[PDB]
Design a binder for this molecule. Structure first.
Ligand SMILES: CCC(C)(C)c1ccc(OC[C@H](O)CN2C[C@@H]3C[C@H](C2)c2cccc(=O)n2C3)c(C(C)(C)CC)c1
Ligand SMILES: [Zn+2]
Length: 288
C-alpha cells in the first residue's frame, strides 16, 4: 500500500496533516543531542575510547562493562565528572517531539540516549522507551534493597569524587543505564510489539540505523508505514530511498535541528517551535 503521495519532506508533511496519520513513533540517537554539547560518545569515530588511557583499564570497553564497573567503579565516575555538561538544554529536535506530544501525534519516542534531554523537554515516562536506560535515576545494585537516588544526588557524588554508595546497605549505586553485559529493558521488547502495530509514521532522527536496536525495529514495522530519516549521514534497517521500487522511505540529509525546523515550517509549526525552544531555554536559564 502507498501512503505517501510523494517521497519528499513536503509529502511527509502532507501525510502528517491528513486524517490517516494519527500515531507517530520517533526513533532517536546521539545525533539529536550533539547540538546540546553532548557529543556522540557511542560511535567509534568520536574517539572517547582513546581518552581512557589514564584509567589503566584492561581494555577500553571495560569502562562500560558491568562486572568491571562493580569491582572498579572509580573510572566510570571519574569519566562522568570529566564530561558532565554545564547545562542540560534540549535541542530544537527535542522540542519538535514535545510538539508531537502536545498535538496528540506522538505514540512513543524510542531513544538510544541516556542524557535525559527528552524528559527535560517535557516527554513523560509513558511517551518514552529508554532503550539504553537513563542517568535520570540511579539505584543501589542490591536486589533486596534497590534504594532509588535522583540525578541531583548522583551529580553531587560525581562532583565530590565520592563513589555512590547506598545509605542503607552500603552497596554500589549505579545510574539506570544499560551497561555492557546487561540486557535491554523489558519495557523495550513489550512496547515494541504493540506500538509497531498501531504506528502510522516512523520519524528516525540522529541515528544511522547501521546499529542495534533500531536496525531491527525499523525492519519489522508494517510494510506500508512511511519512514522519514533526518540525519547528517545516510542510513542499515533495509530502507529504500533511491531505487525504482522506493515507495515509502524519505531521507533529509543535514543537522537534526535544521531538518526539524524545515519539517515544522511545512506543517506551519515553525513559529510555535521557535517560541517553545526560546521559552523553555529561558525557563532552564532562570532555574539553573
Ligand atoms: C554525565 C553526563 C551525561 C549524563 C550527559 C552523559 C551523557 C552521555 C554519556 O555517554 C553516552 C554513551 O554513548 C552511552 N552508552 C551507554 C551504554 C554503554 C556505552 C555508552 C554504549 C556504547 C555503545 C552502545 C551502547 O548501547 N552503549 C550503552 C555519559 C557517560 C557517563 C556514560 C560517559 C560517556 C554521561
Ligand atoms: Zn541499598
Amino acid at each position: 500500500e502507498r501512503l505517501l503521495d510523494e517521497l519528499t519532506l513536503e509529502g511527509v508533511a502532507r501525510y502528517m496533516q491528513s486524517e490517516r496519520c494519527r500515531r507517530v513513533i520517533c526513533l532517536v540517537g546521539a545525533g539529536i543531542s550533539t547540538s546540546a554539547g553532548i557529543p556522540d560518545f557511542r560511535s567509534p569515530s568520536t574517539g572517547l575510547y582513546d581518552n581512557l588511557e589514564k584509567y589503566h583499564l584492561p581494555y577500553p570497553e571495560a569502562i562500560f562493562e558491568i562486572s568491571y564497573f562493580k569491582k572498579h567503579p572509580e573510572p566510570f565516575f571519574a569519566l562522568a565528572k570529566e564530561l558532565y555538561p554545564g547545562q542540560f538544554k534540549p535541542t530544537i529536535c527535542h522540542y519538535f517531539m514535545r510538539l508531537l506530544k502536545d498535538k496528540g501525534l506522538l505514540l512513543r519516542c524510542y531513544t538510544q540516549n541516556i542524557d535525559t534531554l527528552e524528559r527535560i523537554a517535557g516527554l513523560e515516562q509513558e511517551d518514552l522507551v529508554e532503550a539504553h536506560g537513563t542517568f535520570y535515576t540511579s539505584h543501589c545494585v542490591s536486589a533486596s534493597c534497590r534504594h532509588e537516588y535522583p540525578l541531583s544526588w548522583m551529580k553531587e557524588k560525581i562532583f565530590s569524587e565520592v563513589t555512590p554508595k547506598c545509605e542503607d546497605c552500603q552497596s554500589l549505586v549505579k545510574p539506570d543505564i544499560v551497561f555492557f553485559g546487561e540486557s535491554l529493558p523489558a519495557r523495550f521488547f513489550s512496547c515494541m510489539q504493540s506500538d509497531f502495530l498501531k504506528v502510522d509514521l516512523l520519524l528516525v532522527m540522529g541515528t544511522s540505523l547501521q546499529v542495534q536496536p533500531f536496525a531491527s525495529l525499523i525492519s519489522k514495522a508494517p510494510l506500508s508505514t512511511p519512514r522519514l530519516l533526518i540525519n547528517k549521514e545516510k542510513a542499515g534497517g533495509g530502507m529504500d530511498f533511491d531505487s525504482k521500487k522506493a515507495y515509502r522511505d524519505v531521507a533529509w540529509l543535514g543537522e537534526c535541528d535544521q531538518g526539524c525546523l524545515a519539517l515544522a515550517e511545512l506543517l506551519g509549526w515553525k513559529k510555535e517551535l521557535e517560541d517553545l525552544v526560546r521559552r523553555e531555554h529561558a525557563s532552564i536559564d532562570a532555574q539553573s
